Write a protein that binds this ligand. Structure first.
Ligand SMILES: Nc1ncnc2c1ncn2[C@@H]1O[C@H](COP(=O)(O)OP(=O)(O)O)[C@@H](O)[C@H]1O
Ligand SMILES: [Mg+2]
Ligand code: NA
Ligand code: NA
Lengths: 92, 386
């Protein structure tokens, strides 16, 4: 579907760059999502800044919360990519 | 350090962990992969699990079980009022909340249901910590599909009191489905029946699954039918036996009756894999040793009504889901009592010989699913795809 396609393109676009993902996550969130404030790259410079924003994002797209909601499939796709991006970031 | 999955069951609890690409269902220090949901309060100590259940006959009024029947409820609730007649321990009203009351270290003490359940969870956490050689904080904990928000929140609170961070509360029948990887399938939606016969409760759930998304289509069952009732059918049988042989009635001796029940439960388990079982009890009543045998046939006969009766909720769940029995893609056996050969035969016959999913130990299936789910939610089970 279109919302799925948008996420697939986003994921492929950022190449697992956690900063690129977090700074553009507002563009892939479902309509109805009201918690997430778009984050600029200036708020994503230090590892401590990336960790803080990462933790906020996972809370928004958490599968437990999303269970039974119309956007469940999309929360899951975003959650799993964020986790992969974070573990790669941690590897550095 | 990995997150764990905990099946917090009415009668038994079970903990698993997904590590090194496999789920391990974790044995406790007595070697048991399931642990009784029991808590005993003595003059000197607080006992949990096998040690608590094992001393129930000596200390009935201060040994608590069935806390899951109280959790998330008000004292005034019709269910609580009804259930209370069955328990040898005290339940009191604290400003609308039920509390179990016990004697402990020479003092009268009371505990909220979630506090009692936190002691069970604490033990399960320790079971996992022994095995992993490290602290466990994160867990997925399971509940019945029919639990409401009050019962779910109280279950979460039990985790918090046990020093756990609950990643999610998920449904038991859904946990079992996840253990079998049924939510990994793609294409058309598929219908799954979970047949869950435990120690105290019988649950039938019909789930529809499409692209990893669950819908609980219907639920049926009996909250007061389980393995305990099959044990009681055996108990009555042997009380009669002892009265005829010895001109003595053990019925009003609570210690003797409980010791007999313990022996009957053990025999029952044996009858799932053998065609007969022997019972030996030292000095059961007024100095008399009790020795006897029972066959699988006699066990099944003593329970004939209760067994075939499990099919009615199956029928009910099916019509509520608006499905014919032939529309069920998978049947999953869950719960310790589904190890009974006659139960499996009865259900398979109902479904016209269709194969039953039973390769995962039915009493471990819920924990198994919870473990998988806990790893997923922790970022410890990425897919990547080839
Ligand atoms: N091999 C077996 N044969 C028959 N009954 C069994 C067997 N193993 C366990 N049980 C019964 O299963 C019940 C406990 O079920 P379980 O699913 O482990 O817990 P819960 O119902 O609390 O979730 C007990 O009555 C126990 O006697
Ligand atoms: Mg159970
Ligand atoms: Na259980
Ligand atoms: Na059950």
């Amino acid at each position: 579907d279109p919302e799925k396609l948008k996420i697939l393109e986003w994921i492929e676009g950022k190449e697992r760059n956690i900063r690129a993902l977090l700074s553009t996550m507002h563009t892939v969130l479902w309509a109805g999502e009201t918690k997430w404030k778009p984050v600029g790259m200036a708020d994503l410079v230090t590892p401590e800044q990336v960790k803080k924003v990462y933790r906020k994002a996972v809370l928004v797209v958490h599968p437990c919360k999303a269970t039974g909601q119309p956007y469940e499939q999309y929360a899951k796709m975003i959650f799993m990519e964020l986790n992969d991006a974070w573990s790669e970031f941690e590897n550095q | 350090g990995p997150a764990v999955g905990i099946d917090l069951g009415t009668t038994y609890s079970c903990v698993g962990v997904f590590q090194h690409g496999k789920v391990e269902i974790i044995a406790n220090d007595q070697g048991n992969r399931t642990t009784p949901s029991y808590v005993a309060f003595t003059d000197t100590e607080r006992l949990i699990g096998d040690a608590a259940k094992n001393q129930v006959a000596m200390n009935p009024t201060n040994t608590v079980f069935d806390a899951k029947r109280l959790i998330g409820r008000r004292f005034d609730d019709a269910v609580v009022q009804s259930d209370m007649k069955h328990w040898p321990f005290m339940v009191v009203n604290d400003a609308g909340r039920p509390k179990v009351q016990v004697e402990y270290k020479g003092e009268t003490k009371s505990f909220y249901p979630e506090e009692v359940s936190s002691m069970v969870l604490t033990k399960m956490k320790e079971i996992a910590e022994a095995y992993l050689g490290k602290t466990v904080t994160n867990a997925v904990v399971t509940v019945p599909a029919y639990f409401n928000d009050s019962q779910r929140q109280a279950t979460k609170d039990a985790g918090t009191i046990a020093g756990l961070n609950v990643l999610c509360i998920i449904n038991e029948p859904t946990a079992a489905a996840i253990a079998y990887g049924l939510d990994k399938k793609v294409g058309a939606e598929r219908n799954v029946l979970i047949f869950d016969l435990g120690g105290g409760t019988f649950d039938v759930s019909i789930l529809t699954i499409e692209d990893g998304i669950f819908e609980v289509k219907s639920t049926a069952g009996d909250t007061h039918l389980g393995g305990e009732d099959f044990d009681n059918r055996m108990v009555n049988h042997f009380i009669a036996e002892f009265k005829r042989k010895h001109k003595k009635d053990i019925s009003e001796n609570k210690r003797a009756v409980r010791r007999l029940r313990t022996a009957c439960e053990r025999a029952k388990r044996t009858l799932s894999s053998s065609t007969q079982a022997s019972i030996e009890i030292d000095s059961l009543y007024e100095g008399i040793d009790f020795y006897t045998s029972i066959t699988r046939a006699r066990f099944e006969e003593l329970n004939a009504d209760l067994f075939r009766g499990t099919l009615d909720p199956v029928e009910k769940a099916l019509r509520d889901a608006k499905l014919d029995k032939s529309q069920i893609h998978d049947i999953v056996l869950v719960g310790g009592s589904t190890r009974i050969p006659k139960i499996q035969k009865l259900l398979q016959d109902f479904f016209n010989g269709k194969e039953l999913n039973k390769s995962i130990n039915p009493d471990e299936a819920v924990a198994y699913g919870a473990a998988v789910q806990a790893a997923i939610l922790s970022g410890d089970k990425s897919e990547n795809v080839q």
